[PDB]
Every structure is written in C-alpha cells, then in structure tokens.
C-alpha cells in the first residue's frame, strides 16, 4: 500500500512499467474502504498524468488502472469530479468507450456516468463531447440478453445520469436520441436495469408536458404500470415516480395512465408499509382527482375513495397532506353525485380531525374542500343536514376557533363558512 510520495516517484519516472505499477498502487489506494486519500492524490498533481495514460493504446493495463483510479476520484465530491474534468478526462474517456477490452470500455462508461451525474452542466458538457453515439453503440445488439450483466447495468446507470437533472433538462435532441435504447432497457428482465431505466424515465417526465409527451409517445406507460406492481421496492419506487410525473401533464396524458390499468394497483400502493410509496401514491392520486369528472368516476369505480378516506384517517402527516389535496381536487371537479358518494364513504370525520393540524396549508386546503362539499349540498337543499354532520363530527368548534387564526385566507374562509352555513 504505497505512500502518495511513492506513487508520485513511480509516476514521474519516465518508465512505462514503473508508471504502470505506481498507477495500480494509486488505484488500490483510492479503492480503500476507509477514507481513501482522494484529495491527497489530487493535490499531488496526479490527474493530468492519469488522463495521459488513458491514451496509451499500447499498455491497455495502464489505460485500465488509470481509468479506474480516475473513476474513483470522479465518483467522489463535486469538487473532486471537477478535478477529473479539469484534467481533460472527458474526451479521453469517450475515446476509451471504443476500447476492444470490455473491462476498459466499461471503466470509461462508469467514469462518464459519474461525471454526467454531478449536475446538468457536466451532463451537457459530456453530451457536447459526443458521448452519446459511442454509448448507444455499445448496446446496438439485437437482444440485450447477450450482453454481460455488469456491463449492461453500467450502461443503463450512465444513460440514466444523462437523463438526470433540471435547470436545464437535457437537450431535447439528446433525449430523442437516447429514448429508443432506454425503452429497450425498460423491458429488460434484470431488476437493476429495470430500476435505473425507471429512474431515467422519471427524470425525463419531470417537466413540461412536452417532455412528458415525448416519453408517453414511446408506448412506455403500459410497461410502467406493470413495473408499478413489481415486488422489488427499488423498481416500484421509480415506477411510481414516473407514473406520478405523467399525471401532472394533460388530461389526455393522465388518461393513458388510467387506460393502462394503473388505478388497480392503488389499493395496495395507498396502503404500502413504506411511507414514501404511500406519500407519492397519494400525491399521484391528487393529480388524478384534479382531472375530468369521467376520470374521477374511474377513481370511484376502482374503489379508491375508501382508500383516500383511509389515508386521510391514519398516515404519516405528509401523506395526510397529500390526501387532503386529493379530496379538495376531487370536490372541485367532481359532480354533486360524486361528492355525495365521498361523504357517504366517511370523508367528514377524518377531515374535521385534521383541522387540528398546526399546518397552515392543510387547513386552507381542507376548508376549501368543505366549501366545495357545501356547494354540492346547496344544489340539493341539503345544506343543513351537512351542517349537522360537521357539528356531530366535532368540526364546528374548529372552524370557529379558526376565525381568530393568524393567516388571512384561513380566518377569511373560516368566517365565510360559519355565516353561510352555521347561523
């Protein structure tokens, strides 16, 4: 386990073999479990030397060792990754992508993956040096199944990083270019490949509806829905995210999610033991109850209202906050008949109980839901009857105490309610 001092002696001898051996030492050092001396290595000025070895097509072993060493540096902090980039590593790794040694090609893949993932600027800079053709070319085989697992998984993870990040989103033409390959990966039988594809798809659908559209046009929604009900949390998690993003777009885009069978997975998603799954499932549901009355009706037909009632009753508070949002949206666009169904399913009690939440937003949201339900009651004349349920379920006091509340919108609507409906 060489000292940094020795590695530098090795690397600075102009002896190819001493160089090779010193680099290998460096690589083992940087692979150390506890606190590998990345900064030390960086400060010794070794990076340019390493980047230079990447070009020695003759000693492929020093190409490999220096790739690996570089990879372990770039896999660290954003400043560490910057040092690898400043060293000139990007074009050098892109050339390596074409190495006849899979183990070397693979290193280059891994390196570009870590550089692209630092953020959007490095992502784009890597795209500019033309990484995409050589990357995609590594996957230009009729059946992905003939590729080695580790290899495929690295390719998938790297491509995922090139899809990652906002401000800005990746170049559109880059996203067009990558999609068809990313869609093949999304249909692959390997759990890790699947998870990282979904992550990629979820990155790409986080944005303007135009972005959502290019993804949905590829026909991935049915595959997403399938992965939505997988047994592996690492797959479900990103799949739910991609689904959730898509239903933030147009109603027609949301309809494709409904059409693919997505809603049938929500009984279990909305009761999922993992809190974030539940949270995001309720979030997703809120952007579905924000849609058309026919889409709300499908939420109804799938038996999901009793599940929303459930989540509103007992769940992590954040989840409850999403549930309140889903009910307000439901009461907004819903028909009177649908709103009536919501009450019969037991929405009032758990609604009133959350008016005790010391969270200004959820209060504003709930009171909004209460108006919408009252206005439905008005069209039936049944405004009084409702007024009673809310007193019987303990709400009247809370809507009252909320007159005095610090926020304006809160005490405004708190008062509005009492006058129209409670006097």
């Amino acid at each position: 386990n060489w000292s940094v001092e020795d590695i530098v002696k090795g690397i600075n001898s102009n002896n190819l073999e001493s160089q090779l051996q010193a680099t290998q030492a460096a690589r083992k050092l940087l692979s150390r479990e506890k606190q590998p001396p990345i900064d030390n290595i960086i400060r010794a000025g070794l990076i340019p030397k390493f980047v230079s070895f990447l070009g020695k097509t003759d000693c492929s072993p020093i190409q490999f060792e220096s790739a690996w060493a570089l990879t372990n540096i770039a896999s660290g902090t954003s400043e560490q990754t910057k040092a690898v980039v400043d060293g000139g590593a990007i074009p050098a790794f892109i050339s390596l992508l074409a190495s006849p040694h899979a183990h070397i090609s693979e290193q280059a893949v891994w390196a570009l993956g870590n550089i692209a993932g630092d953020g959007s600027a490095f992502r784009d800079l890597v795209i500019k040096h033309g990484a995409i053709d050589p990357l995609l070319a590594l996957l230009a085989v009729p059946d992905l199944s003939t590729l080695a697992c580790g290899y495929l998984r690295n390719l998938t993870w790297t491509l995922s990083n090139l899809c990652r990040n906002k401000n800005p989103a990746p170049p559109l033409d880059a996203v067009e270019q990558i999609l068809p390959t990313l869609v093949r990966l999304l249909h692959h039988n390997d759990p890790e490949v699947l998870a990282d594809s979904c992550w990629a798809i979820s990155y790409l659908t986080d944005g303007p509806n135009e972005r959502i559209e290019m993804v949905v046009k590829k026909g991935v929604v049915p595959q997403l829905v399938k992965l939505l009900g997988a047994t592996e949390l690492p797959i479900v998690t990103p799949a739910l995210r991609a689904i959730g993003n898509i239903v933030t777009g147009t109603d027609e885009q949301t309809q494709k999610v409904i059409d693919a069978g997505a809603l049938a997975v929500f009984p279990s998603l909305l009761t999922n033991p993992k809190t974030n799954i539940q949270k995001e499932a309720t979030w997703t549901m809120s952007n579905i109850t924000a849609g058309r009355q026919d889409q709300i009706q499908q939420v109804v037909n799938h038996g999901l209202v009793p599940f929303l009632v459930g989540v509103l009753s007992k769940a992590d508070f954040k989840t409850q906050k999403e549930a309140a949002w889903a009910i307000t949206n439901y009461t907004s666009g819903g028909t009177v008949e649908q709103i009536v169904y919501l009450v019969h399913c037991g929405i009032i009690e758990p609604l009133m109980n959350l008016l005790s939440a010391k969270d200004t937003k959820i209060i504003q949201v709930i009171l909004d839901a209460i108006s919408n339900i009252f206005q439905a009651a008005e069209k039936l004349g049944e405004t009084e009857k409702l007024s009673i349920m809310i007193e019987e379920c303990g709400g009247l006091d809370k809507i009252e105490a909320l007159q005095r509340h610090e926020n304006e919108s809160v005490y405004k609507a708190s008062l509005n309610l009492i006058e129209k409906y409670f006097s």
Binding site: T248, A290, G333
Partner: peptide, 8 residues
C-alpha cells in the same frame, strides 16, 4: 382547485 402539483 382543481390544482396540479408537480415535482419530486
């Protein structure tokens, strides 16, 4: 309402 919320 009806309000779309992204992000995540």
């Amino acid at each position: 309402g009806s309000i779309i919320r992204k992000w995540n």
